[PDB]
């Protein structure tokens, strides 16, 4: 019944052992590709989102028997090239000293040591990841290590990259590696029960999920959220924060209303469905309102928790597969020369479970939970003392900022890169708690002991020369330059 470009997918997938839960997801993307579907989700087809409930309004926790059941994963597969890395971005450095793995490590043991004793802690790799991961556990946290082909990894799928004409699998004799691509992060449902590993979870007594970035080291668990899923019986549940200027990559939660028409004399009752919309799934030509933070002002942090027995049987009862919404992102096959072969790289995000099932919900969640490193200039911000340490190792705002971070505005033609970044706070990160906004401007590089105030723009307008600023330099509400 397929087409002989997707039999050509079925095929390649088949002869390189992919896992079949993965070809079958796969392919059900590439039907709805070949008939037109794009991942686009206009502005005329949603609404926004104006009532959740709110995490600062729950009290109550969970018992010992639901936080025992819960699992922790963290994402740990993508690649980071928007912010020049070629590794993991994990084993960046974050305090002095300290990477996101080493506070995700020391969260899990904080946990371990006053919370749930056996808490288990999974990564979901790639192997553009898995190496590093795993002899970073091996030198700084060996408990870890010796459990991480057993319990923690979970290894990501890859797809094939399709030719954007044919949406035949693309070839590139030069580097076949390059004719595969991880499917998103929406890939975990995948790999966890095509690897089998979410049936033994299951069976193992495990019935919570609680998912996060693996950039976000605000993301731990709370066990009202356990308690609050116990009570109202939620499947699925999407931590959102309140938008910010700061939030421009990711995606926002949304709604439709679909309307289960009357029945024994009632009225066609309206019900709110949720959806997730990337960026990527905004037509590019619209991304002015995927920017009006006004509009949906509900930014999704990608902390989610999943009911894992419900997700099991959802997915069994659907071929054994999630059928998320595909993304179709543009590439070429070797993604640095423009002149290969254009292809799709079919992928999905995992916040995007929130329309597969029927008690899915979201509620408003304060930012402490939300540290999100998209950009170098996330990572400034990161970096600097507008964000600090707590007890449990989370990575959370200053009280002083009062929920918002400083708008951090860098060059991307010389701190877009992590190497361009490293060089601009070469000599030291300056403070940033009292600044508001920040913006840099040309060729620029810090001093020590610089103090932000307010908001501060420092501009070069000669950038054949960089504009060092000198030591213990405290700018206030103004505009720096040479
Ligand atoms: O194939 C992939 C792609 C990504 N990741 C991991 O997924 C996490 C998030 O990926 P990132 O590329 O950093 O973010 P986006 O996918 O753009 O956005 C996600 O995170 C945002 C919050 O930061 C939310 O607003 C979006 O809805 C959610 O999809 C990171 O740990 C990545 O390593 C994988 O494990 N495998």
New binding site residues.
Partial sequence: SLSAAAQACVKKMRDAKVNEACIRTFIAQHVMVSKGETGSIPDSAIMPVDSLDALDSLTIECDNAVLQSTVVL?????L?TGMGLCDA?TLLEVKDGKTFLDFTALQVQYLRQHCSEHLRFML?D?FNTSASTKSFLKARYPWLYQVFDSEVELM?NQVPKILQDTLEPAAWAENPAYEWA????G?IYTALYGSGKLQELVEQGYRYMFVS????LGATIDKRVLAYMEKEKIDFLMEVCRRTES?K????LARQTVYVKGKDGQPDAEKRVLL?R??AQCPKADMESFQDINKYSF????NLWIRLPVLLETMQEHGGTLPLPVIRNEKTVDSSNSASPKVYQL?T???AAIAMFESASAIVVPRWRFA?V?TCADLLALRSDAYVVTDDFRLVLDDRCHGHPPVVDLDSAHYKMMNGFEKLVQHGVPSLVECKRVTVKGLVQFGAGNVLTGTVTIENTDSASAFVIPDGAKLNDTTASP
Avoid: C, I, R, V
């Fill in positions: 963290k994402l740990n597969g993508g980071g971005k979901m790639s990501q991880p499917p998103g992060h890939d970035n693996g950039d976000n939030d990559k990711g995606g926002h997730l990337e960026s930014f999704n942090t990608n992928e995000a995992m916040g999100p998209k």
